[PDB]
Structure 1
Amino acid sequence: MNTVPFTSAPIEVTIGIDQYSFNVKENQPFHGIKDIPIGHVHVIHFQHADNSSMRYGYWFDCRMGNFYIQYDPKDGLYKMMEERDGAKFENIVHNFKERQMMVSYPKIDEDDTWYNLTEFVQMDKIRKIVRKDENQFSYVDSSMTTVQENELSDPAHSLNYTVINFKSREAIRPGHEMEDFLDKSYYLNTVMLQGIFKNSSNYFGELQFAFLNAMFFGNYGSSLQWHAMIELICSSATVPKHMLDKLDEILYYQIKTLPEQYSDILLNERVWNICLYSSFQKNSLHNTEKIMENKYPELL
């Protein structure tokens, strides 16, 4: 069980850790989050009480180093940092725990939600989508644009999601125009799975990461990426049976977890209606179709 200590909480802020969140008051004696489950990526995220604009946060894995949060009054945000001195860090964490100034990661034992949302998500893959190689953790916020959004402006602060474009030479073999446009199996299986992602695990990892960025930061480009990766599978007539069964589970937990009130901005009507009712895979996402029909029948 790992710990992310906070030096202090000088400004009033809603702090999220994965799907959980806590209101902290200005100069409240808050010194961090303990009992963080080892074996998963995590995200610690912020929304200032004074600017409900810019949700921002940090993807990390406690196995990769000792991370803490410290408010920077110049840049005006909570920053993640690595403590390289193991003894200084254990000494800081033991003190804060003794004084019970830390919240406990509030995992219910029965609850596999976070595992289910992060099953394929790997810190090494996150660090290639979010490039800042001098840190072991990854900063994401509401406003960061994707490589694809930039093509259609600061590349240092971009989300480098795999570009998916259904009307591209990459997606359409010369001489198979109609076949490849109506059945995207060659784009999914040869270009994307065999070619770029290497396996379905890396593909699902980026799909899950895009969803979580959309949900936790309202990152519009991430939402575009999540939908494109869903639509590429559902629009393929030929998908490995293990991929369809896994996609149904992945989407089920994403829809289950989404705030009921955010369905209007985070869910693309055309993609979902196409995927559940028209696509080749219309009959292959039973759990996802059942949760969508019972939770968001308006959207459909």
Structure 2
Amino acid sequence: MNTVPFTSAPIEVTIGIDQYSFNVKENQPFHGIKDIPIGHVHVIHFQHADNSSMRYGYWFDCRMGNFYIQYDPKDGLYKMMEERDGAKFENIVHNFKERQMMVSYPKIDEDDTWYNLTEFVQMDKIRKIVRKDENQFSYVDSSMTTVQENELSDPAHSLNYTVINFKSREAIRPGHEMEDFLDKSYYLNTVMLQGIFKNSSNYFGELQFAFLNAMFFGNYGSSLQWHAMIELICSSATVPKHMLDKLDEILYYQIKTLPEQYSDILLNERVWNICLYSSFQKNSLHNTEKIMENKYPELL
């Protein structure tokens, strides 16, 4: 179980750690988060009380280093940093734990939600989507645009998700125009799975990471990416059976975790209705269809 200490909390802020969140008051004696489960990626995220605009946060994996948060009064945000002096860090953490100035990662033992949301998400892949190689953790916020959005403007601050475009030469074989447009199996299995992602695990990982960025930061391009990756599977007539079954589980936990009040903006009516009711895989997502029908029947 690992710890992310906070130097201080000088401004009032709502702090998220994965699917949990705490309100911290201005200059409240908050000094971090302990008992963070080892084995998963995690995200710590922030929304300032005075500007409910720009949610922002850091993806990290405590196995890769000792990380802490420190407010920067010049750039006006909570920044993640790495402490390279291992003894200096253990001493900071132990003092803060002794003074009980840390919240405990509040995981119920029965609860597999975070595992189920991050099953295929790997820090090394995050770091290729979010390019900043001098850090071991990755900053994401509400406003960052994706490579694809940029094509249609600062590249250093882009989300380098895999570009998916159903009306592109990459997606459509010369001479198989109608076939490839109506049955995207070639594009899914040969171009994307065999070619770019190499395996279904890396594809699901990017899908899960795009959803999490949409949910936690309201990142619109991430939402576009999540829906595109779902649609590409559902619009393929030929998908490995293990992928379909895993997809149903992945989407089930995503829909389960989504705030009920955000379904209006994070859920694309066309994609979901097409995927659950018209697509080749209309009958392959039983769990996801059941939770969607009981939780958001208005959308459908």
Say whether the fold is shared (TM-score over 0.5).
Answer: yes
1:163, distance to aligned residue in structure 2 (A): 0.1
2:64 maps to 1:64: yes
1:211, distance to aligned residue in structure 2 (A): 0.0
Q: Separation in 1 of the partners of 2:110 and 2:136? A: 30
Map Cα deviations across residues 125-173 of structure 1 (whole Å, 9 max, x no partner): 0000000000000000000000000000000000000000000000000
1:261, distance to aligned residue in structure 2 (A): 0.1
Q: Secondary structure at the match of 2:53?
A: strand
TM value normalised by structure 2: 1.00
Map Cα deviations across residues 5-38 of structure 1 (whole Å, 9 max, x no partner): 0000000000000000000000000000000000
Q: Separation in 2 of the partners of 1:165 and 1:147? A: 12
Q: Separation in 1 of the partners of 2:275 and 2:148? A: 22
Q: Separation in 2 of the partners of 1:260 and 1:6? A: 31
Q: Separation in 1 of the partners of 2:25 and 2:14? A: 9
Map Cα deviations across residues 230-273 of structure 1 (whole Å, 9 max, x no partner): 00000000000000000000000000000000000000000000
1:111, distance to aligned residue in structure 2 (A): 0.1
In the other structure, the counterpart of 2:135 is 135
Give 4+ residue runs of structure 1 displaced > 6 Å after superposition.
Answer: none
Q: Secondary structure at the match of 1:52?
A: coil
Q: Separation in 1 of the partners of 2:143 and 2:65? A: 28
Structure 1 unaligned blocks of 5 or more: none
Q: Separation in 2 of the partners of 1:153 and 1:217? A: 19
Q: Separation in 1 of the partners of 2:250 and 2:134? A: 32
Structure 2 unaligned blocks of 5 or more: none
Map Cα deviations across residues 83-131 of structure 1 (whole Å, 9 max, x no partner): 0000000000000000000000000000000000000000000000000
Q: Separation in 2 of the partners of 1:153 and 1:74? A: 24
1:287, distance to aligned residue in structure 2 (A): 0.1
Identity %: 100
1:281, distance to aligned residue in structure 2 (A): 0.0
2:17 maps to 1:21: no
1:190, distance to aligned residue in structure 2 (A): 0.1
Map Cα deviations across residues 27-82 of structure 1 (whole Å, 9 max, x no partner): 00000000000000000000000000000000000000000000000000000000
1:222, distance to aligned residue in structure 2 (A): 0.1
Q: Separation in 2 of the partners of 1:35 and 1:6? A: 14
Q: Separation in 2 of the partners of 1:48 and 1:186? A: 46
Q: Secondary structure at the match of 1:71?
A: strand
1:229, distance to aligned residue in structure 2 (A): 0.1
RMSD over aligned Cα, in angstroms?
A: 0.1
Q: Separation in 2 of the partners of 1:299 and 1:39? A: 36
Q: Separation in 2 of the partners of 1:94 and 1:153? A: 44
TM value normalised by structure 1: 1.00
1:276, distance to aligned residue in structure 2 (A): 0.1
Q: Separation in 1 of the partners of 2:256 and 2:225? A: 19
1:206, distance to aligned residue in structure 2 (A): 0.1
Q: Separation in 2 of the partners of 1:147 and 1:226? A: 14
Q: Separation in 2 of the partners of 1:273 and 1:38? A: 38
Q: Separation in 2 of the partners of 1:95 and 1:72? A: 23
The 5 Å alignment of 1:71-220 reads 71-220=71-220
